[PDB]
């Protein structure tokens, strides 16, 4: 039966078939990697004043690949809290050798964008199961939360912090926890218990020794943060947002928030996919007085740009533009160099505050509920490239900014 | 417009821009594979009167990749069945040349774990569509289910059984069907009809000759199974369970069950994501009396390890810990050799079986529903490495177990 | 000392599976030649006249994607994927020579997207093709339909427009009157505007890109329909396959007189195979059977589960000729130019009672089938070669 | 096919639940359904 298609061939087929050389689907070739072990090691936190927490990563192994921050809290009220594990964290500044190399500023905002934008259903659902306590559980129940810190080296093992190669200075993470009663809105005044567990990779001796002694230049991502105060009115307002960024970036994100909760829309609830609850009419990204593209609707930026690049689209109020065509792989495929374009400006035109409710008097396409007048800010995030050079047991950034 | 991105460049771009050689994403570097055909040749199955039936794979092609075991049954009750196709199968032992090389023991248990651990929302939902039937259909409706047996060679075509290279003996698997009238709960005194359809790949002479004549060595996975009695009491009891496993493994999974149905939680229902219905409070692995890591909570094993190992977390009751950094791909990236360590132990601490009516009066973090006292056993699965050598028409394992 | 023990726990068993120079912690990089992308808004000719088309203007070196922005309003009708159902036809031709022709466009787009798009891209596809149910009646929103053109599947087979210096690329397509959709919302002329994504390359890539000849191994789409009178009894239809080029999969279904409904259920997204029309099918090559007839549920879920991973809604049936149908690389195909006879035999199910949960046997479907069904469609996705030499592009076969 | 067919069990709602058509069930609840 099937052999008919194997023998019934001609030139049109031979053009697209392969030769008998070793590039076929089968003839499995065994692939090997060096001998290494992974261990998850508890890393005791010396700082608990209810202020900035300094977590020093001990050299308990050769590489550090992932940081898991374990937080224990109780459900303070009937309302289900919205990522309470990440809202408790206000920022995380990673430094190497004393130099700050990665800044996660306004931490719950970057992680919620990160989850909705770059994580798939199986990992989004998991991230919620260990961060977003919304089952109908009793008030006062205690849960352990397991949030990750989205640092530049946690996406691929190949960028793991090469601590064995840093013989003179350590790596530390400065995490500031917001007071439990400030934002979450669902807290029992029970002081959270915070523990940190991170992993270590152990290499076998041939590579371990070579790796520690061989100077290596690591091409890594850095996170840059900007925010400002932003308001809307009953007219279709326009604003020029300055973009104080340096170094090549693959994409740029901005979001309009009611920074009281994780809500970017008029809905007043944790998630929304209806653009009619978001207050951005259109936008364009401009450099040096000249326009790379014409103004496109707010909905375009939420769904079309990230879908073409990587499938996924966030909730409304989150808007993304990509400079390259692939922003999730390790290979750099297109970036805009913010150190060479002197005047980078994001131009945002908003929708008018005219409606009372979306379901009754929402206008055709340029208005929404007046609830938008409670918007407080736009935050902007971008991921840039830099080089982490580890040389003679000390590290730092190759490009100073 | 966009051309500004290419003129405003400098040294910073040297670390992302490639050379003048064809390493760009366009001017596609086309890959080509040889022509092949595939056919699904039905296998005759000998009578299965609640007993073992042998399925023999004949030489009707060069490679076989997957075995589809099709069962036609009818609903005998108003209870919605839970994977009735997998519950009907009780085990499948695969042998090569008469030597058993792969076993799936307590079959519905491993396949439900396998589906939750390995299959994405579309593959997972589809696998349910061909194994469950849950609309409110009348009693007596007949449906055919298409169950793929997760044998070691089904995941990637390149490891397909190299049958053309095994000229002196056959390959068969013994599938046993214990009963329709025990656990599914949908028996209608109806003997289901079982058919098996398997695929074949047919290669052209250049690779077919090379492949049938040359020596081959395939790195394959083996499934090892262990179970013991695991009761839970109203106090925080512990258990110290021996782990009688051999060979390098990538991960191990252990689960607690009410072996009466497919339920791993006190909820009485499948797919519960609320740890309030799961018994394990914390656990650690130990080898030769020395502890691999500090005790981590039960919820850590159900929701955190899975993120690095699978990018997918199972429902509660299924606990996994990995040794490698990737447990679903073909390349081995870290494993622990259970043949060299003489004493492997799993140490489990449970929560107190003191809770009731969980949605209202559940205690905070140290208890679970008292219904846990109806749990009887723990099952442990692990995937180990072995080597399938094929030489002069005979195949088998290098490491006997 | 967990990791230390794991490294001490060594032996021959590990040597077979790991070891050697290859180190995943080598911390290496790959680089690509620089490029930049933007979206150019272009006009569509003939929109209110007859059959519209666009000429792609030279605003860049490569064309990587085209998508169409449609703006329209909600009017209580409750329709599914309006953006797709407003379009009936789309083709792309090089120098007047058609190389990708999409007939029965609205169903092609929905089926190709459901079969190949994953939960994140498929969900977004929904979001940009449909309405939000929470919206007020009369609301207006933007729709962004990505056109399933052969060059948009993968960055790397973008149209080398700079290399086609003598003839241009025209995309002809047709629209349904807005009123056509069974759930149509309004007599509102939609605003319809096209954006084309242009790629800029570096100069040294432009030089070797135009100077050397190009061969792209590309997908072509095709279409065949045969109308039927659907039987009450499980008779067999003989569906000829009058196609030529090599293919990796083909998809067939029993269509109704609406949009997107491929089964008798009357729910829109139907996961319930009870309403499926096909009992079993067998494909024949040169008048001889390739396999034992398999039931409709095999082709509805088991085959795409292996080939793509994604299962369509009930009523869509697929058969694959290769190992990995979603891949950009050819992984097995059947050559329809060399097989003398190609046919697919489709045996329909027997008619039974309404209230679909009631269906009892794999061989049974609803008696509503005779009224709702009008035909059998077939799609076949083929490999061909797009050759570009000295400014002229054409399909080799 | 996901979320468009029906449910298994235990729907928890943090807000309202709105229907057009008819609802087929009955139990204790708010102020009414108890006289």
């Amino acid at each position: 039966g099937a052999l008919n298609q194997l023998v019934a061939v001609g030139k049109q087929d031979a053009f697209i078939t392969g030769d008998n050389l070793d590039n076929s689907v089968w003839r499995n070739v065994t692939k090997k990697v060096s001998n290494f072990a992974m261990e998850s090691i508890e890393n005791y936190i010396n700082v608990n004043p209810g202020s900035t927490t300094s977590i020093v990563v001990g050299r308990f192994g050769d590489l550090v690949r992932k940081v898991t921050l374990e937080i224990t809290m109780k459900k303070g009220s009937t309302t289900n809290p919205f990522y309470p594990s990440e809202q408790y964290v206000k920022y995380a500044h990673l430094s190497i050798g004393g130099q700050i190399v990665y800044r996660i500023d306004d931490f719950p905002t970057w992680t919620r964008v990160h989850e909705e934008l770059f994580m798939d259903p199986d990992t989004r659902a998991t991230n919620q199961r260990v961060n977003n306590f919304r089952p109908e559980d009793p008030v006062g129940a205690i849960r352990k939360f397991y949030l990750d810190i989205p640092l530049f080296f946690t996406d691929d093992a190949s960028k793991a912090l090469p601590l064995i190669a840093l013989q003179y200075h350590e790596v530390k993470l400065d995490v500031l926890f917001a007071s439990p009663g400030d934002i979450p809105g669902i807290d029992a005044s029970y002081t959270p218990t915070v523990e940190c567990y991170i992993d270590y990779v152990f290499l076998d001796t041939p590579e371990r020794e070579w790796f520690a002694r061989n100077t290596h230049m690591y091409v890594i991502e850095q996170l840059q943060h900007y925010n400002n105060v932003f308001s809307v009115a009953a007219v279709e307002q326009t604003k020029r947002l300055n973009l104080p960024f340096t170094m090549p970036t693959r994409y740029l994100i901005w979001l309009l928030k009611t920074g009281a909760d994780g809500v970017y829309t008029t809905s007043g609830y944790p998630f929304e996919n209806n653009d009619s609850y978001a207050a951005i009419k259109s936008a364009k990204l401009q450099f040096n007085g000249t326009d790379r593209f014409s103004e496109r609707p707010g909905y375009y930026f939420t769904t079309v740009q990230p879908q073409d690049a990587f499938g996924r689209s966030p909730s409304a109020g989150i808007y993304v533009y990509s400079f390259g065509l692939d922003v999730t792989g390790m290979t750099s495929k297109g970036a805009l160099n913010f150190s060479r374009m002197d005047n980078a400006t994001l131009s945002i035109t908003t929708k008018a505050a005219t409606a009372a409710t979306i379901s009754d008097v929402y206008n055709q396409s340029t208005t929404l509920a007046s609830a938008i007048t409670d918007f407080t800010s736009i935050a902007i995030y971008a991921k840039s490239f830099n080089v982490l050079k580890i040389d003679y047991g000390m590290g730092g950034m190759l490009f100073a900014n | 417009g966009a051309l500004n991105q290419l003129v405003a460049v400098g040294k910073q771009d040297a670390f992302i821009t490639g050379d003048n050689l064809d390493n760009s994403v366009w001017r596609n570097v086309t890959k080509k594979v040889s022509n092949f055909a595939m056919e699904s040749i039905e296998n005759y199955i000998n009578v299965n009167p609640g007993s073992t039936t042998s399925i023999v794979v004949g030489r009707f092609g060069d490679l076989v990749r997957k075995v589809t075991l099709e069962i036609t049954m009818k609903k005998g009750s108003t209870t919605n069945p839970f994977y009735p196709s997998e519950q009907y199968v009780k085990y499948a032992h695969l042998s090569i040349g008469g030597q058993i090389v792969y076993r799936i023991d307590d079959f519905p248990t491993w396949t439900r774990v396998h589906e939750e651990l390995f299959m994405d929302p579309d593959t997972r939902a589809t696998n349910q569509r061909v194994n469950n039937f849950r609309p409110e259909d009348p009693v007596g409706a007949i449906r055919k289910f298409y169950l793929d047996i997760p044998l070691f060679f089904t995941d990637d075509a390149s490891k397909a059984l190299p049958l053309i290279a095994l000229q002196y003996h056959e390959v068969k698997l013994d599938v046993l069907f214990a009963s329709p009238g025990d656990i599914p709960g949908i028996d209608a005194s109806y003997t289901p009809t079982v058919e098996c359809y398997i695929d074949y790949v047919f290669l052209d002479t250049p690779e077919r000759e090379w492949f049938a004549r040359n020596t081959h060595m395939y790195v394959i996975e083996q499934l090892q199974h262990y179970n013991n009695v695991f009761s839970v009491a109203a106090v925080e009891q512990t258990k110290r369970l021996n782990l009688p496993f051999t060979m390098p493994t990538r991960y191990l999974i252990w689960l607690l069950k009410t072996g009466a149905d497919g339920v791993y939680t006190t909820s009485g229902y499948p797919f519960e994501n609320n740890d309030s219905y799961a018994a394990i409070k914390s656990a650690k692995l130990q080898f030769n009396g020395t502890d691999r890591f500090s005790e981590r909570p039960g919820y850590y094993f159900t929701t955190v390890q899975p993120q690095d190992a699978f990018g997918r977390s199972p429902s509660a009751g299924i606990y996994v810990y990995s040794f490698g950094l990737d447990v679903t791909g073909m390349t081995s990236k870290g494993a622990l050799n259970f043949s060299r360590m003489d004493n492997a132990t799993l140490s489990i601490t449970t929560k107190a079986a003191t809770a009731a009516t969980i949605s209202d009066v559940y205690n905070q973090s140290t208890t679970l529903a008292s219904a846990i006292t109806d749990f009887t056993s723990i099952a442990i699965y692990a995937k180990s490495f072995n080597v399938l050598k094929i030489d002069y028409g005979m195949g088998g394992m290098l490491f006997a177990n | 000392s967990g990791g230390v023990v794991q490294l001490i726990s060594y032996g021959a068993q590990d040597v077979y599976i790991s070891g050697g120079p290859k180190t995943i912690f080598k911390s290496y990089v790959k680089k690509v030649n620089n490029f930049a992308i933007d979206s150019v808004k272009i006009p569509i000719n003939g929109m209110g006249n007859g059959n519209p088309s666009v000429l792609i203007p030279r605003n860049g070196d490569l064309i990587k994607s085209i998508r169409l922005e449609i703006t329209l309003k909600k009017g209580t009708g409750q329709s599914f994927y309006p953006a797709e159902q407003l379009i009936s036809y789309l083709a792309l031709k090089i120098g007047g020579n058609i190389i990708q022709k999409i007939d029965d466009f609205s169903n092609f787009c929905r089926i190709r997207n459901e079969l190949f798009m994953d939960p994140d891209e498929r969900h977004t596809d929904y979001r940009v093709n449909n309405f939000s149910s929470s919206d007020v009646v009369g609301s207006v929103k933007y729709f962004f339909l990505d056109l399933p053109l052969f060059f948009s599947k993968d960055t790397s087979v973008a149209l080398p427009l700079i290399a086609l210096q003598y003839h241009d690329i025209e995309l002809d397509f047709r629209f349904n009157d807005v009123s056509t959709i069974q759930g149509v919302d309004a007599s509102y002329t939609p605003t319809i505007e096209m954006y084309i994504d242009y790629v800029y390359l570096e100069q040294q890539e432009r030089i070797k890109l135009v100077e050397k000849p190009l061969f792209y191994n590309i997908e072509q789409c095709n279409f065949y329909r045969k109308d039927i009178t659907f039987p009450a009894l499980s008779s067999t239809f003989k569906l000829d396959i009058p196609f030529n080029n090599p293919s990796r999969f083909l998809v067939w279904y029993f269509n109704t007189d609406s949009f997107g409904i491929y089964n008798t259920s009357g729910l829109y997204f139907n996961s319930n195979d009870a309403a499926a029309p096909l009992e079993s099918a067998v494909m024949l090559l040169n008048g001889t059977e390739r396999f034992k007839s398999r039931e409709g549920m095999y082709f509805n879920c088991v085959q795409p589960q292996q080939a793509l991973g994604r299962s369509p809604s009930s009523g869509i049936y697929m058969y694959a000729f290769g190992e990995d149908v979603a891949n950009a690389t050819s992984k097995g195909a059947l050559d329809m130019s060399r097989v003398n006879e190609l046919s697919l035999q489709l045996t329909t199910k027997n008619a039974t009672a309404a209230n679909v949960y009631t269906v009892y046997n794999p061989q049974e479907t609803l008696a509503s089938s005779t009224s709702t069904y009008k035909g059998i469609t077939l799609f076949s996705t083929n490999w061909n070669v797009l050759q570009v030499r000295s400014g002229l592009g054409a399909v080799m076969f | 096919p996901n979320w468009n067919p029906f449910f298994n069990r235990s729907i928890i709602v943090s807000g309202n639940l709105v229907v057009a058509g008819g609802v087929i069930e009955g139990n204790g609840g708010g102020l009414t359904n108890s006289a």
Partner: peptide
């Protein structure tokens, strides 16, 4: 996701339901 709980034309549920408020016609038991 589980954040646009809007359905068209069909619904059945096996277990118990929990909610704050409600609406719709009445054919209810007791």
């Amino acid at each position: 996701p589980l954040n646009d709980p809007i359905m068209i034309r069909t619904m059945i549920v096996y277990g118990n339901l929990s909610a704050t408020y409600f609406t719709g016609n009445g054919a209810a038991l007791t």
